Amino acid sequence: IDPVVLQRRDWENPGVTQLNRLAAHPPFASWRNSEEARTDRPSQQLRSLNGEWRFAWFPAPEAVPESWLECDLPEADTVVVPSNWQMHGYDAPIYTNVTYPITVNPPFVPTENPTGCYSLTFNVDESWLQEGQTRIIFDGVNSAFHLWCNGRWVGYGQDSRLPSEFDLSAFLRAGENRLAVMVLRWSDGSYLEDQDMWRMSGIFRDVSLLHKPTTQISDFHVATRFNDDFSRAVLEAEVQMCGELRDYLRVTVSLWQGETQVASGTAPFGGEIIDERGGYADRVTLRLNVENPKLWSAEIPNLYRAVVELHTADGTLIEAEACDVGFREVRIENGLLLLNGKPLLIRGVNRHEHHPLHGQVMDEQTMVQDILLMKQNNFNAVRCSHYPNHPLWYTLCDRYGLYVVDEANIETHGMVPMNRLTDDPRWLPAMSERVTRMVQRDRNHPSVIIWSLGNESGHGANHDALYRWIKSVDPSRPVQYEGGGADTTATDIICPMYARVDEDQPFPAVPKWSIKKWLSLPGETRPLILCEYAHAMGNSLGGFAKYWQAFRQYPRLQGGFVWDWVDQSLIKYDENGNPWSAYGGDFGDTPNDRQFCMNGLVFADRTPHPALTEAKHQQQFFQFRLSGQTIEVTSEYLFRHSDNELLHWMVALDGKPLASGEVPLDVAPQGKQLIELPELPQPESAGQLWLTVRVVQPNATAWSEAGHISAWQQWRLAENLSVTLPAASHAIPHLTTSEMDFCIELGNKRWQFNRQSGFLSQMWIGDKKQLLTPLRDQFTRAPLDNDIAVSEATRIDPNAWVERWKAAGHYQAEAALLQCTADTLADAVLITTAHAWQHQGKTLFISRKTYRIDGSGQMAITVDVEVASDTPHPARIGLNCQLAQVAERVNWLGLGPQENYPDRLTAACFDRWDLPLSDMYTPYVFPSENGLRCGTRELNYGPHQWRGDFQFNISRYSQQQLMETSHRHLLHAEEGTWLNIDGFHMGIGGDDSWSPSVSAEFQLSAGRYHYQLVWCQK
């Protein structure tokens, strides 16, 4: 194909971002019936061209044969559109984080430029061509394209994340027509699309045809302005037209509240005088008064319907357009972000448009599934990281109720320095279009409360210009932008990524201050909402509660957006057709950044990670205090009463329920309720009483089913310590001493301590061996993504926990025996052991133990550990062994039921839990230490019971296998069951995942540690 199209190379020129593209505008449907517009029903004037298309792949646009313009290529395939062509296997998707997937040489792209040739033969009815305007709408094309209709060149478009529209009126004929779309993978637009995500291409959002009359609504803006107490509002609708102006033309704007018309107004065209040359003859603004409007919030998403009718004075409708209207005010005042006059607390998450099968194509089902899960887990806000979303997303957020940060498709992370392009006025045109056309599209959505200038593009003069452009065109929403230090002149909100709660990170030029400190820096007055925090990569969200404590305590700390919602894993199939989750590098893509695309609170199929429950608990909308027998409930709702809430309470003695009841909740927003519990029966047993409360929603909502639990909290009540001594045992265990073993016999039970190793190597119950691997101290864990601390494949931080561990010899050190002795007591055998772990003549740890086996068949293991002060703090201080048994169930008295770690255990509840063994393993795509449960007093597995105060995990996978396997699908069940029982376990961290992030209070730094376990048969 040629000639001007190939010679001009528009995809290597940031001065050309489009040719012949129509102006951006809010969603249109061109209804010719007002009632269909009101009810938001399908429009005959809006056709989908989604479905089966013809497609051929080429290595470069030069390889595209001319004949393709005229007719179908025989070698083409029939494929579904929308789609990313990488998902159909035509070439590899690439995962890189920061480094561009192409040589950095702006505005040039590689000569080998994968080219997708899409075509469609389709019908157009004569009615559509006799009169009016027929346009084609490409909602998303990645990254740039030329368009032909029936062999004739139509135009060109850039920006993968906003719609490109072209007038086809002069190109079409009645009956059969053919479209030819040449999509280029790389363009100068790629320099503005360096988001930390899979790099794909193609026609990946809807394609549609829209018919508008020649005289048409071309744009409209809806604003809602309020009095001081929000009891009065004015809806202001500016309407623009194209076509010939006539005196008989009219616009009517009506506002609907369900079936009730609340207001209507009509005017001819002709705006007020704006300057010395007059006003806009082709515009009119309608003003409607609304008394006591029902206000829109995420809490209660009240919506009205505005209908915009273009018509003649005699009453003949030309066309109607429409939108949902949410009556809400967003403003920053005295340093606080307010919604309808009340300060928001953002329970937010970043959300990419990712599907493990369809790549970056978004469907309604997945969108709805995401929103439901978000709301069920107490999220009220979403950031569109890092591009305008599929248009349906905003409609759903409007109707379900979520606060939205709408973000321009501008990320230049890979530039050196980051602002090389954004400070260059030659790139201001390309940047402006990414901002301005976003605003023009999305400005009528009530769910959009904040505009964002993009992501990770430094701070340049181009940001300041566009910041001001938005502030000028839309004063209704704050503008934020994190680049260049998070608090620049281009942001209304201090919006850092991964600024910690208490700890400063004083990077040169772009420091990350403690969020508490940041607020009070000399002269600073703005609110702080983190654009990204609590990096949810694999086994993560350590310290999430620290953020939420601070958000609640500090008025100007107004929350943040977790990074992020969903793992960007992709599905591949093995030789047997079995699906597996894949990450960076698994497609032959290179260079790549491996698992760094998986940072989600949920797996790609939307199965929750364990971190999601911690998020739900910390983001609860009711706060609880206990005083005596009085529960104080405080509502953090700003607008709604608790009109779908009852409080269930339960008192239990070590898991055994003793008393329970329920009280309806009747709490005003920001209000308090006092609940006096009845007099509780005193227990005639030793142990700890535990109070658990939970908030239950009795009725189904749009986002939840009847019985949904929205909040919970636990307290210790009375404890009665056990003073009664167990009865003197009848049986007495016997000590047999050989050269190789200390053996202990009690009935048909046997304990065998290997005297060379100094470990318990075997146990027998009759003729059944109990151990496959001896019981040994363990001080290492299979490294979490946080311990590894890598964000770019070719970058290692020597301070990373795994790096320090490896270098200190933690994973290398082996036990050296210092002492192994045996003694007979009055009613017990006492085995005393001392070991040392060494690396290069350096003692890392010393473990001193006693094993006391008594007549009741209980083995009491007392362990005292020394950790050298100059060695890096160990991942854990515990024991492990491989059990011969494989049982169906795991039953424990401790924190659960889900996986919990010391810095991520607030959501867990103390109680008696019983799960299948498989649930005790968390299938993180990148395998690591997982499945731990803390605060555990009793553990039951098969014939075994362990008692003490410990943390444990239990599974068919050794720490050794977990640390040696890169992918979960490659793990194999080992013989029997691996048990890791820890006196102490280090935090998991997660403030970020590319530097040490475990807070000091969760590091194993005490130097000397003590724990005790009792092992017996159940």
According to the annotation, is 196 in a ligand binding site?
yes
- CA-to-CA dists, residue 868 to 89, 746, 787, 846, 1001, angstroms: 54, 39, 20, 9, 18
Tell me how far, at minimum, the Cβ of 134 lies from Na ion, in Å. 42
Determine contact, residues 497/513, Cβ cutoff 8 Å: no
Side-chain-side CA neighbours of residue 238 (13 Å) = 16
The two tokens of residue 664 are 């309806």
- Decide if residue 1000 touches its own copies (CB under 8 A): no
Near ligand 2DG by CB under 6 A: residue from 137, 184, 306, 497: 497
**Alpha carbons 641 and 666: distance in angstroms, whole number:** 7
- CA-to-CA dists, residue 76 to 54, 55, 121, angstroms: 6, 5, 13
The two tokens of residue 1018 are 């159940």
Residue 456 is a catalytic residue? yes
End-to-end CA distance of the chain: 79
Residues near 940 by beta carbon (within 8 Å), at least 6 away in sequence: 890, 891, 892, 1018
According to the annotation, is 554 in a ligand binding site?
no
According to the annotation, is 125 in a ligand binding site?
no
Tell me how far, at minimum, the Cβ of 558 lies from Na ion, in Å. 5
Q: Print burial letters for 814-853: b (CB count within 10 Å at least 16), e (below 16).
A: ebeeeebebeeeeebbebbbbbbbbbeeeebbbbbbbbbb
Active-site residue identified among 532, 645, 899, 929: 532
Tell me how far, at minimum, the Cβ of 599 lies from ligand 2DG, in Å. 5
Determine contact, residues 304/255, Cβ cutoff 8 Å: yes
- Decide if residue 407 touches Mg ion (CB under 5 A): no
- Decide if residue 614 touches ligand 2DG (CB under 6 A): no
According to the annotation, is 532 in a ligand binding site?
yes
Residue 927, contacted partner among ligand 2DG, Mg ion, Na ion, none, CB below 5-8 A by kind: Na ion
Residue 131 is a catalytic residue? no
The DSSP bridge pattern shows strands 94-96 and 197-199 to be antiparallel
Rank residues 665 and 932 by Cβ distance to Na ion and give the closer one.
Answer: 665
Near its own copies by CB under 8 A: residue from 731, 825, 970, 973: 825
**Alpha carbons 252 and 870: distance in angstroms, whole number:** 78
Residue type, 682: Q
Q: Which of 540, 584, 582 has the alpha carbon at shortest distance from 562?
A: 540
- Decide if residue 146 touches Mg ion (CB under 5 A): no
Tell me how far, at minimum, the Cβ of 917 lies from ligand 2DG, in Å. 33
Provide the CA 491 distance to its chain's centre, in angstroms. Answer: 23
- CA-to-CA dists, residue 674 to 567, 647, 662, 663, 929, angstroms: 42, 12, 13, 11, 43
Near its own copies by CB under 8 A: residue from 506, 721, 737, 794: 721
Task: Tell me the DSSP string of 2-49.
Answer: -SHHHHH-GGG-TT-SEESPPPP-S----BSSHHHHHHT---TTEEE-
Residues near 627 by beta carbon (within 8 Å), at least 6 away in sequence: none
Rank residues 72 and 827 by Cβ distance to its own copies and give the closer one.
Answer: 827
- Decide if residue 407 touches ligand 2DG (CB under 6 A): no
- Decide if residue 349 touches ligand 2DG (CB under 6 A): no
Residues near 260 by beta carbon (within 8 Å), at least 6 away in sequence: none
Binding characters for ligand 2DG, 453-492, by CB under 6 A (x = yes): ---x------------------------------------
Rank residues 521 and 818 by Cβ distance to its own copies and give the closer one.
Answer: 818
Residue 599, contacted partner among its own copies, ligand 2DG, Mg ion, none, CB below 5-8 A by kind: ligand 2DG
According to the annotation, is 88 in a ligand binding site?
no
Which of the residues 8 through 67 are near its own copies (CB under 8 A)?
A: none
According to the annotation, is 969 in a ligand binding site?
no
Near its own copies by CB under 8 A: residue from 19, 267, 680, 868: 868
**Alpha carbons 71 and 50: distance in angstroms, whole number:** 20
Binding characters for ligand 2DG, 176-215, by CB under 6 A (x = yes): -------------------xx-------------------
Tell me how far, at minimum, the Cβ of 593 lies from ligand 2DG, in Å. 10
- Tell me the window of 23-31, 349-357, 594-602, 868-876 that interacts with its own copies (CB under 8 A): 868-876
- Decide if residue 763 touches Mg ion (CB under 5 A): no
- Decide if residue 656 touches its own copies (CB under 8 A): no
Determine contact, residues 456/412, Cβ cutoff 8 Å: yes
Rank residues 157 and 927 by Cβ distance to Na ion and give the closer one.
Answer: 927
- Decide if residue 193 touches Mg ion (CB under 5 A): no
**Alpha carbons 391 and 444: distance in angstroms, whole number:** 12
Which of the residues 591 through 610 are near ligand 2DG (CB under 6 A)?
A: 599
Residues in the chain: 1018
Q: Which of 659, 810, 599, 722 has the alpha carbon at shortest distance from 97?
A: 599
Total residues binding Na ion (CB under 5 A): 9
- Decide if residue 729 touches its own copies (CB under 8 A): no
The set of catalytic residues is 456, 532
What are the binding residues for substrate? 97, 196, 456, 532-535, 599, 994
Binding footprint of ligand 2DG on the chain (CB under 6 A): 195-196, 385-386, 456, 497, 532, 563, 599
Binding footprint of its own copies on the chain (CB under 8 A): 688, 716-721, 723, 725, 816, 818-819, 821, 823, 825-826, 830, 834, 836, 843, 846, 864, 866, 868-870, 949, 1008, 1010, 1012
What are the binding residues for Na(+)? 196, 596, 599
Binding footprint of Na ion on the chain (CB under 5 A): 196, 551, 557, 596, 599, 645, 664-665, 927
Binding footprint of Mg ion on the chain (CB under 5 A): 10, 13, 16, 188, 196, 413, 456, 906
What are the binding residues for Mg(2+)? 411, 413, 456, 592
